[PDB]
Every structure is written in C-alpha cells, then in structure tokens.
Write a protein that binds this ligand. Structure first.
Ligand code: SVB
Ligand code: S3C
Ligand code: ZN
Ligand code: ZN
Length: 231
C-alpha cells in the first residue's frame, strides 16, 4: 500500500497521505544500473503547504509540483531541504522559479555549494548545535547532531505525531550502510538517541528512502551503523 519502485516510473511522483494534512512524496532515481526510491514530506499549514525536500532532481520536482496541484490544490509556499545531497536539494532551482521560498541551514547551504549542488535561498538560524530545535510553520526542525551527514535535520509534525527522519534514518529492509562518504559514523548512534529523547511520542517514522514504520527504525539504524563501523 505504500508505493515501491516497481510502481513508480522514472520521472513520476506519488503522494501518500500519512495523517490529516500530512503526506509523503515518493519518487525514484536510477543510478549505476539500479533504481532507488526517495521520500519527502508535505505538511498543510492553513491554506498553504510546506514542502520538506525535493523529489531528487529537476524533472521529478516539476512532476511533484504538478501532482501537488492536481491532488491537493493548495500552494507550496516554502520548502526546507534537510541536508545537502541531490535527493534533498536537486530541484531547488525548479522550486525557486515557481515562486517557492527555499530554506536550509547555513551548514547545508555551505556544503551544497562545495558540492556544486543547488543551494536553497534562505538560511535557517538556530540549528547549529546538536539538540537545537526551532519551529517552522506547522513543523519543528531538529538538528540531532552529525549522522548520515554533518548537517542532517529531522522534522516533526506535532499535530500528527509524524517524525520525518530523512536520510539519518534507514528503512527496515536496508541492512547495510549505504554510501557513508559524508557520514559521521562515530556520532550517528548518539544523534539517533537525541531523536529518541526529543520525540518519544512519535507514531509514524519516515525514512529518507523506503517504507515508513515506527520508532523501531531508530534502533534499526543504530544496529546497521554499528555493524558497518565494525566491518
Ligand atoms: C549516489 N547514490 C548513493 O550513495 C545511494 C545510496 C543508497 C544505497 Cl547504497 C542503497 C539503498 C538506497 Cl535507498 C540508497 Cl539512497 S543511491 C545513489 S544514486
Ligand atoms: O543514503 C542516502 O540517503 C543518500 S542521500 C546517499 C547519497 C550520497 Cl551519500 C551522496 C550523494 C547522493 Cl545523490 C546520494 Cl543519494
Ligand atoms: Zn544524503
Ligand atoms: Zn538520501
């Protein structure tokens, strides 16, 4: 019932309603001859929408905006990218051209620039130290510390008890560490524990790639990271 790769062709995007006024968006990308799924979030804020992450590329992100317009019919006025990789910021120029205000932490903006990736316009203050949280419209943004990346943010929707872990949290079917080129393996379990401490009441946990679940995804990710550490 949650959409998988086989159900989403290259260039298409699906929306999945998680709770009232909260959806994930699901897209796919092909690389190195394999196909990968990717998630972001959409949160209603009155008569407008907040977008969390792009749909991994310009073409997908254009399709995302068109699917939002068709299915939901409310304007995306702001978008937050939760770290600097292309699955999170690829498509920011499309958002910007469409009149969406784009945001990321100054840490993410800096790393995107170094990588040659698209750079969200606005800088989110107040997220520089592990454990920091700020409200942004209908969500809380939380910097748990370095994990999948040094800049990774998580997002919580308090009205719906939805925690969007982004790429710091792995789906259950993922048993090996992916590409950890930019990760802080040493800190990742501690950063996960900060998420658990701050959001123990979360009822839905959305990873950056793959199937949602509950808070078990946190300990799952810790297990995978620690096994990789000991490789
Ligand atoms: C570059 N590039 C990576 O590092 C990917 C990581 C990944 C892996 Cl290894 C396995 C599964 C998933 Cl879902 C992902 Cl996201 S996909 C991709 S393109
Ligand atoms: O495992 C993940 O969640 C991500 S974002 C992997 C990745 C990395 Cl490490 C660099 C670059 C790109 Cl494009 C991707 Cl997809
Ligand atoms: Zn990443
Ligand atoms: Zn990712």
């Amino acid at each position: 019932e949650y959409p998988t790769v086989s159900e989403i062709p290259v260039g298409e995007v699906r929306l999945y309603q998680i709770a009232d006024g909260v959806w994930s968006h699901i897209a796919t990308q092909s690389f190195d001859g394999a196909v990968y799924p990717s998630n972001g979030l959409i949160v209603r804020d009155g008569d407008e929408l907040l977008l969390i992450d792009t749909a991994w590329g310009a073409k997908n992100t254009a399709a995302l905006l068109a699917e939002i317009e068709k299915q939901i019919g409310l304007p995306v006025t702001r978008a937050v990218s939760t770290h600097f990789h292309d699955d999170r910021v690829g498509g920011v120029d499309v958002l910007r051209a469409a009149g969406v205000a784009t945001y990321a932490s100054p840490s993410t903006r800096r790393l995107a620039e170094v990588e040659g990736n698209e750079i969200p316009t606005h800088s989110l203050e107040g997220l520089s130290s592990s454990g920091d949280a700020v409200r942004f419209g209908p969500v809380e943004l939380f910097y748990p510390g370095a994990a999948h990346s040094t800049d990774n943010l998580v997002v919580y929707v308090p009205s719906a008890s939805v925690l969007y872990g982004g790429c710091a949290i792995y789906e259950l079917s993922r048993t090996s560490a992916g590409n950890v080129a930019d990760a802080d393996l040493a800190e990742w379990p501690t950063s996960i524990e900060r998420i658990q401490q701050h959001y123990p009441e979360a009822q839905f946990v959305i990873p950056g790639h793959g199937l949602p679940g509950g808070l078990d995804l946190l300990k799952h990710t810790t297990n995978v990271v620690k096994a990789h550490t000991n490789r």
